[PDB]
Paper text:
In summary, our results indicate a new mechanism of DNA antirestriction played by protein ArdC, by which plasmids increase their conjugation host range.
ArdC-Mn crystallized in the P32 space group containing eight molecules per asymmetric unit and the structure was solved at 2.7 Å. Mn2+ is tetrahedrally coordinated by H201, H205, E229 and an H2O molecule. H205 is oriented towards the metal by interaction with the conserved E228 through the non-coordinating nitrogen atom. The E202 residue of the HE202xxH motif orients and acts as a catalytic base for the activation of a water molecule that coordinates the metal. By analogy with other gluzinzin metalloproteases, the conserved ArdC residue Y255 could stabilize by a hydrogen bond the polypeptide chain to be cleaved.
Numbering used by the authors: 7 to 32, 40 to 103, 111 to 135, 143 to 292
């Protein structure tokens, strides 16, 4: 009946139940046109695909199913994704409403199309991605990986100390996600830092890093972020639209990375 709550409570459950929704992939969800879902809806459809065991990336509405050449298997229940309708004021103002979609594995008769390994060394195509992001990446024998907004650079340790390029680039993807949201770019940090503002950042960063790593073929590192799920639980309980604001920032952090990395002069 209430959307923000309804969605926040699914996410609060997943956290308690073990895995927060957005970690569940370890294929990104698509609409009937091939356009990928964004933001909070990627998160929601991921948890939904895990919880119902879906193999397909595609989600349809009853309308999209029927008038495409198919039928929603009766008994099948959809799940709630997010979008905007309009109210009039003086086709005018947007407002957030939910809606129901069904995965392709709940549907019969749909058309035909509908259903790596990196060692321990530098990878050229990954190196080109992060070089094309624009990020000051500095390397030093200091054994910590971090983003310093004050200098505005990412510091990686040396790749060989990782004994895993997959571990090396996931960590970099994570820092690249933080690197967005410096004042010159996405403008996301708190002004005055504390246990709450670090908690928000690394949640945006986490959700965002899953989104990034899904595209780059990497696996996110979740050891580093075990001390926060409680603040996330607390903040998610006290604020029923907080998860929407995080997922929107997260998607913007992934978008900025990939868009820069394709800024072909
Ligand atoms: Mn971080």
């Amino acid at each position: 009946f209430d959307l923000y709550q309804h969605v926040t409570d699914r996410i609060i459950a997943s956290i308690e139940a073990g895995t927060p929704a957005w970690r569940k992939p370890w294929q990104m969800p698509l609409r009937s046109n091939g356009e990928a879902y964004r933001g909070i809806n990627v998160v929601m459809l991921w948890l939904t695909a895990a919880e119902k065991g879906y193999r397909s990336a595609y989600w349809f509405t009853y309308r999209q199913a029927k008038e495409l050449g198919g039928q929603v298997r009766k008994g099948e229940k959809g799940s709630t994704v997010v979008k905007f309708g309009t109210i009039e004021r003086e086709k005018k103002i947007p407002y957030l409403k939910g809606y129901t979609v069904f995965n392709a594995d709940q549907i019969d008769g749909l058309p035909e199309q509908y259903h790596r390994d990196l060692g321990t060394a530098a990878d050229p195509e990954l190196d080109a991605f992060f070089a094309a992001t624009g990020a000051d990446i500095r390397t030093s024998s200091e054994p910590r990986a971090y983003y310093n907004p004050t200098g505005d650079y990412i510091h990686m340790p040396p790749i060989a100390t990782f004994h895993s390029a997959a571990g090396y680039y996931a960590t970099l993807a994570h820092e690249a996600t933080h690197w967005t949201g410096h004042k010159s770019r996405l403008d996301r940090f708190s002004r005055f830092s504390d246990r709450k503002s670090y908690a928000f950042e690394e949640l945006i960063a986490e959700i965002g890093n899953c989104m990034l790593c899904a595209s780059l073929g990497l696996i996110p590192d979740f050891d580093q972020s075990a001390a926060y799920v409680q603040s996330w639980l607390r903040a998610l309980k006290d604020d029923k639209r907080l998860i929407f604001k995080a997922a929107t920032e997260a998607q913007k952090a992934a978008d900025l990375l990939q868009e820069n990395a394709a800024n072909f002069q």
